[model samples]
Target: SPMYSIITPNILRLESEETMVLEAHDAQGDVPVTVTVHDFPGKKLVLSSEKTVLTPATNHMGNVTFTIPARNKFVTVQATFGTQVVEKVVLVSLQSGYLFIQTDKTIYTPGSTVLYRIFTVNHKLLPVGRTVMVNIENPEGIPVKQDSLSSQNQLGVLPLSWDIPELVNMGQWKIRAYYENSPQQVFSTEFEVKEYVLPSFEVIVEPTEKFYYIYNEKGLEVTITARFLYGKKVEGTAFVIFGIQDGEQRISLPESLKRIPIEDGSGEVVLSRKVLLDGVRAEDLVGKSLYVSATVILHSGSDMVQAERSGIPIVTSPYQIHFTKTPKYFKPGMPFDLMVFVTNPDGSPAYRVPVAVQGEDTVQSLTQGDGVAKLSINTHPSQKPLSITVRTKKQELSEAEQATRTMQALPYSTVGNSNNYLHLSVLRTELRPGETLNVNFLLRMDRAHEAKIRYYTYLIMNKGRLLKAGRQVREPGQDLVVLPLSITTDFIPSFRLVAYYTLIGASGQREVVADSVWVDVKDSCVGSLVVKSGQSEDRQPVPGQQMTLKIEGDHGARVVLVAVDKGVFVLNKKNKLTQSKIWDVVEKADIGCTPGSGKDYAGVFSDAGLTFTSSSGQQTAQRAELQCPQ
Candidate 1:
């Protein structure tokens, strides 16, 4: 199986470390894998156990971390599983740190304050105190100024300013930022040296309609709106000129000047199909788009400003199809609704337009307010995902035009009752300190009422600790269970609750489902263990069969007995309590590998979990049978 993937960027940051995991989808969960890295030329480094066996728990992955050596050459990283080999490349270079310089303004006057910032990343381990050398040059690429920018950390955001001396050219300037280690990987930005002027007002002219239809007797409209930089509408009168260009064949109509009235800032003019018919009829270029150009003159008593819009676009169809509402997945026997919007070439909802919605069946409807067409569909079971399409009947253009004018969406396959698997809800999303939070969870299975009862577990994690945890069951016809949580200042800001279960139904398919919800505590008040699990080496562990489990911990540490179905635990790996997870608690980070070992032994056993055993921590045990419905 090609269940193996290793991704490495084009260039690896020299001297920095890269961490990645290798996945295997073979028959064995603990197959031995070997990871090796080879530097440019012929240097070899065995990253981990020449034979790294993955954790048998719930992980089929093994990670490897290696610090890129100081070589500006291509490196090779390979992971071998048995005889099968998977590899990726590592082109070591400094550009991976990607640095850049930015100035406050694009251009400056002869004598002005030049402010700028230097930036870079810590893809390479952060150097406590270091500097990025920056060089400034003139329009002609002549060296002008050079300086060193210093920063305490990654040097991501470093600001510096300089004054432009009175003796400087009036063209452009360049600034390059780089590291002394790899000067060749230079990055630069340029700024204009010449001055700029501020204008009083701006005039814009464009077609009011988004698209045009030559077949339509009525044409399009254009707007002439003018505004000052300081946010005031321009007071003026306007004249309009229009031009038609056939990009389809390199032919055009001379400018058409039409007097138009303007007041308090904006003006609108109607352009009839007459423009397309003058000299050259619309039929002359059937498949061509008549590009329309508009130029408006803002005659503000004494000043005149002009702007124009030119585009080679006309709509193939009078209306476009847009779906306003749809489902992400289908539920068998469940009727769903679809809402479509049909818009005219101009944008106003094209009411009375004929629209068809097709999927399991075809239903026709008319576009009403805002061009909306609502459709309802009902279907029966067992099928793959299907695509739903909405199209306009009166405006169906060429196949190419239909592709863009129509709307189609595909919902996930018709699987279980709702794919809604598990649902968690609370009386309130916001809670206050010293308040009790009520939580509700719902479990749904397709036609589950015909089956026996089922069980599920809830794990609540807050502030790094899973303080509250337990399991629940839902009898046939009953799918809702509620739990009340006591909150203190400790629950100040937020907490997450994960609910999961495994379902085996009449369909003979095994399904694992889970869901989590994050609750936030608001207002002034807002703001919001350990255990090893071990099974005995008895005869066998089966439903209603007796089994043994031992609990271990520190001397003063207390132990708790918790049991749940394995299928449910595998539903969501995040809900698992493992050793590396505990290590995360102590290290406050994931090192990928074990401490001192300098290899990914920890990652090989990423799911390595807790077991009570120590010179100090104590232990306990449990004797019970798997609970099952009679």
Candidate 2:
């Protein structure tokens, strides 16, 4: 029998760029022996352990040797046989060495010096006396000369040094090491040089003249230009992030609006949306406050190191709008007439400019001329008290508008002091289905200098009862719009309606108009159920005073006389009118005497409240009835 065995060490280790050996042997000999080795799956070779005839050395023993290249792992073995063959498995392992790189400084001025050190640690047992090559890559792909001082070159320890001169461009660089014997063995690391004494970049959101008047558009110009201490064109990438703050909340600009790399050092950027500032109308923003901040990022040529600076705050003055009387109230089903006055902070009239009015539901537009804007709010009788927001932008200040008007004022001050303001009215209210009413509003105000004023009107109703209102039953034109409303209910017991308007003027100037109307659906309708008097107490009363009655049916039906007339008219949900006839004294007597061609009984008077009795072929029952006090 042949036995198999392995002669190599159980665990073998080698570095990345080194070689190792594996020895194998077999127990039997002279029976045709074989030797082989395998790489398992090598990047270069596959099954290296082919067959090799082993004729047993002169000593009459089977043996085999296998070699491994640097940075490789494989298996080796030898075999012998008689009737049964003997075999053994051998494995080879590799170990790697490391070189640690370090620097003492990260940030350096444009004209400052830098120093670095390099060290190596051998992972294997062999001492390292081989020289290790070092390379330095500058910020601009330029190779730089380096000086080295080695204190030791032992297998487990290697050391070197280098120096960098002042005046190196602020950026990053790469340092690498390679073994002299095996160029394939290498390692690398990076180093960065930061900008020293970051430059101060200033941006002025140039305010327009005439702050506080309504212009089509108005806002400050964001002029961003950098001033380097050395007076050099900002050599690196310029990036900026702009933000606005309202109270405690802050809003950063969208990526599309952020400042990126630009070829020109100076350019103009407008901060107006259709001449409106911060989404508010110029006329509305005066006197209110806003905060703006911008951050500029300066990057070095290497694109790795960067510096930043921020701008200070800019404040706006109070805006003034000119107007005569304020619109305090509105009439249902009528268009409201208003004159909006506007001017600059200096109290000068603002003329022929565009204005925007934002409401709770949508946005609208208006144009002003001669510092005065005339507006007509067309609305339904059911709609009232619409909310409005007005604004003007700087771009709207045409070259002509700005050329004629001089002076840099805070954004929106042209319309007013702040970039935002609110307009409110009590216009729309709940109205019963199919019910109609009229409302009127009257307003009075004092005249003022050139000023800007804005107002709005609309309708809002309960979330039920699909209600529609217009000027007429049909053929209602666009001027008389329908306010379609629905209530979240089967029927609204009652509702309140109101009409309102607003007026703006110069500083501390304002006017308002408001009125209310109410309607009930059930009270407006006529139905079945009439009143018939038979006894003294049941007789209908005179027209001066009115009588109230309640009647009920077997099926839980109820009827009440909202009004009384000749016979009796009933009122219902649909307002349908129903009446019944009652016999008169003359008619009753004549008809009775002629009955069956027989003489009628003479009339008899009794003291028991004129008690009367009668018999008829018809029988009728009062389902239910009740009386109401006058």
Candidate 3:
């Protein structure tokens, strides 16, 4: 019969109280005996208990139990058969003297008891007996309370209870715990506490070297700040050391500093005041730098404390503002709109600032939504492309959160209505290939004006080009002004309307060409006819006479009409001509209106004896008597 094996636990292996068991099994009687134990991989156990006989005679089992010593580590048991060793690894975990306190929240009220839990694994409680005590230290005068654990639990697990005494005084606090064992160890952690507060301060006397100048009145803003020993904000009693230096004693400011309000905790306080140093006789110091320092006393309860210092730099003297002219360009007239964009040192728009032009009252206008200022000025046509000196005196501090006030000047060209001019109107006429469309002209200008206007009159350009050019006219008066032109074209081309004008003086003439506007003129239609005043020179026709002949044709066949005389065309009752030669016939093609009895006659020929006749016997005329050949 084969023999089975049994394993046992030993001393020095258990760091704490542990349990051990011996295994026994029956196989064949007199079975071979082998016992082994394992700790980790790569290390084999050569030390095995000597073989022991099993009493159950070939078919029974037995067991033995033992206690393990206090030691932390791992042990295993095994039995051998032939070349195989059956093994089982037992993990022995240890408990150390330490506590990890945890809380679900970061902020808590004073005296709040922070709770924790405790548990034990792989071993029994320490000393199989002792307990632990916890304490907290913070504002020295607060009393701390302790809670007893209702369960037997240890480290490597949760704690049962916790507490923090009321430490209402703001600052940092520490919580600690110690084991009651003869040789005790401590564990601890710290946290911060604080109360909410606001800042306060007042503007002291703000003085500047160039403060009196109307243009420089708001250039510098000097401020002083003060806070109590307890870190609270305080008001009044702040003084600033200011003024231009003549090399010895520091000149004091005329006005003194004031106090500001503050809170119980740490914060900031600001007091702002403007400085003035206008028209003071110091050309040498005009561009020289000036400086100011501030000191303040903050009142908190019964104590008054001095705060840290702060100051600013200022420039004194002539404070000259200058302008740079823009290069001359094409434009309309004087007093046009010029755009000036203002920017800070940071390239951000400078808002709510007063921009002043030298010798002129400061113009109070804000920048456009785009940070551009459009100013209108009457410019002398000969004035070297006028440039106005601009200065932006600081008004109020920016409502902005950031605090830097660097500024820059940007100038843009101005434009108006002085150069070339254009007035466009179209008469009822389809623009056809190879036809001259006469456009009326009216243009006037002062001497020495240089300008030109050009447009497409040809009707056969691309439909798009023709429609784009539609009806356009340029009026002319001065030799510098170009006359409105009549256009005749057989094939529509992309035509451009251009006007180039120039100003002439003792310095000679300056030329400015307007932007060329182009349009396609291919096969376009004009729904309504437009007439230009003074276009047709002759407005009157004598009785029984012809003024001008107008002809309309289809397929190379044409009909002609004559504006014979004044008031020659008149409609009659019954819409039937009584004395007209064309109305005396029965041809169906010569009628100008719906011919019926009692219908008013539509008149085409003038009452002064105009004539309407067709060589093809098929002609249509303005409302007149009609006769169709039967």
Q: Return the TM-score for each candidate structure.
A: 0.44, 0.23, 0.22
Candidate 3 residue spans exceeding 4 A from truth: 1-240, 243-281, 297-335, 339-374, 378-630
CA shift of 185, model 3, Å: 57
lDDT of 1 by residue, 1-630 (tens): 323433232234455565544444323656667777786556576344345665545245555555654424666667676676665544455543545455656566678877777655443212223467888889878877888766555335667777888788888678887876668767677766655443466766767666666666777677777766456787766766655555534454554566666677788776677775774645554444444443334464555555555553565565667653232333333444455667765456777776665432346677665466666565544444545666666553553444223333233221243343455555533466777887776655656432433555555444323435455656676667777777776553445555545444446543334444445454231110333335535443556864444444445432323343322221111223333333233222111111110011111111111011111111111101111112
Number of clashing pairs per prediction, in order: 10, 72, 82
Tens-place lDDT digits, model 2, residues 1-630: 122222222222233221111111222344443434444443343224424433444212223333344434344333333333333333343323445554444434445444444444443212344456778778886668543434243433444445556656557776776655446656665666555443333322323332323342444445445434334344334444444444356556553154545334443444453433544334444333333333344554432222222222222422234323224333334454444455554455666554433331233234343354444565454433543334443362342333211111111011232111111222322344543333332222222321222221222221111122111111211112233334322223333332222334345333222222222223222223435543337544665866554443334333222332211111101212212111111121111111010000011001000111111111111111111111
Sliding window of 10 residues with minimal summed lDDT for model 3:
594-603
Better of 2 and 3 by TM-score: 2
lDDT (Cα, 0-100) at 474 in candidate 2 = 15
lDDT value, candidate 1, whole model: 0.51
Residue 19 C-alpha lDDT in model 1 = 50
For model 3, what is the C-alpha lDDT against the true structure?
0.33
Q: Give the whole-model CA lDDT for all candidates, comma-separated.
A: 0.51, 0.34, 0.33
Best by TM-score: 1
